[PDB]
UniProtKB/Swiss-Prot annotation:
Span within the parent record: 724 to 1036 of 1055
Chain residues that bind a divalent metal cation 1: H72, H106, D107, D217
Domain PDEase: 1-312
Record comment regarding domains: The tandem GAF domains bind cAMP, and regulate enzyme activity. The binding of cAMP stimulates enzyme activity. Composed of a C-terminal catalytic domain containing two divalent metal sites and an N-terminal regulatory domain which contains one cyclic nucleotide-binding region.
Task of the protein: Plays a role in signal transduction by regulating the intracellular concentration of cyclic nucleotides. Can hydrolyze both cAMP and cGMP, but has higher affinity for cAMP and is more efficient with cAMP as substrate. May play a critical role in regulating cAMP and cGMP levels in the striatum, a region of the brain that contributes to the control of movement and cognition.
Binding sites annotated in the UniProt record for 3',5'-cyclic GMP: H68, Q269
Subunit organization: Homodimer.
Expression across tissues: Abundant in the putamen and caudate nucleus regions of brain and testis, moderately expressed in the thyroid gland, pituitary gland, thalamus and cerebellum.
Active site: H68
Binding site residues for a divalent metal cation 2: D107
The protein, known as: cAMP and cAMP-inhibited cGMP 3',5'-cyclic phosphodiesterase 10A
Subcellular location: Cytoplasm, Cytosol
Similarity comment: Belongs to the cyclic nucleotide phosphodiesterase family.
Amino acid sequence: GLMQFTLPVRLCKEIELFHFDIGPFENMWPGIFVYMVHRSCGTSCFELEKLCRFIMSVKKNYRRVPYHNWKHAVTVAHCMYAILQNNHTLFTDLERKGLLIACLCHDLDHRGFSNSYLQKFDHPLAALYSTSTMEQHHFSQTVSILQLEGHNIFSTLSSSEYEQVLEIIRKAIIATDLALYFGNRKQLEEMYQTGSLNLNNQSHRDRVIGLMMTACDLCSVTKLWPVTKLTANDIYAEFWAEGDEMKKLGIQPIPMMDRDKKDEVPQGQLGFYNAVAIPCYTTLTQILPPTEPLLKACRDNLSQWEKVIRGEE
Ligand SMILES: Cc1nc(OCc2nc(-c3ccccc3)cn2C)c2ncn(C)c2n1
Ligand SMILES: [Mg+2]
Ligand SMILES: [Zn+2]
């Protein structure tokens, strides 16, 4: 009970900032997550022993893929920590509990391939889950790990609080299917502008948590430029492997995934910032004003990709 995680001074300070990078020391990432749960949620949200066992089972179930790996899990949870800490009073006790766990679990057992690739391959997961294929898998893997002996971090919740938190997690993880983000953000855009947005309406809160999940998931575009740029290499290492596997099925991949079209990456990043990232953080900032630093960092990174295209880097 009296056992805090403490971080070295630089991390204790920088972890509070949206643009924090969790570092290359994998052994510190569990501690960083527990620290974040303790500050976000409280020192008795979870039994430390069960939480430590849950974290290590989650870690084991992330694969050694270039991008959709344990580092991404913890990175996405940190962005959620920063959103929750800057919006203290807007979220319930259950939501704070559920959303850091959701973020840690959101890409469990990811193979480095898109929903499209699984469907074109005719992977068994594409028969079991016809839409949001990997995301329904990720939720399935989260429930599996929660049911291991000694891994039920929610055991101290009442029956209906348990049902509510697993429902928060399920929706939060499904919302990371980027195919669903575009319509979710359009509806939030409409609701905010006509003034119908009501955070006491559960269907509206679901939508806002969905958008928070997209914001945390895309948060590589909200880091300092050297982090954004080096993370983009890991992102494209997966896309280009998927592209190779598309070519093995006799399907020309989209250019994003074709390593033969590396030269078009900077123009492809502009499209991504303009069509996905900037609109994501703009609507998030309209709904949750203290998340503005994410939008500001995203715009700075857009300007850096604009400089790459102008051959100034
Ligand atoms: C940082 C980042 N970038 C992404 O896509 C960039 C992207 N490159 C292209 C492209 C590249 C080369 C040639 C032609 C087109 C298109 N587009 C959308 C992401 N997609 C999902 N996530 C999480 C992403 N995060
Ligand atoms: Mg995912
Ligand atoms: Zn993700």
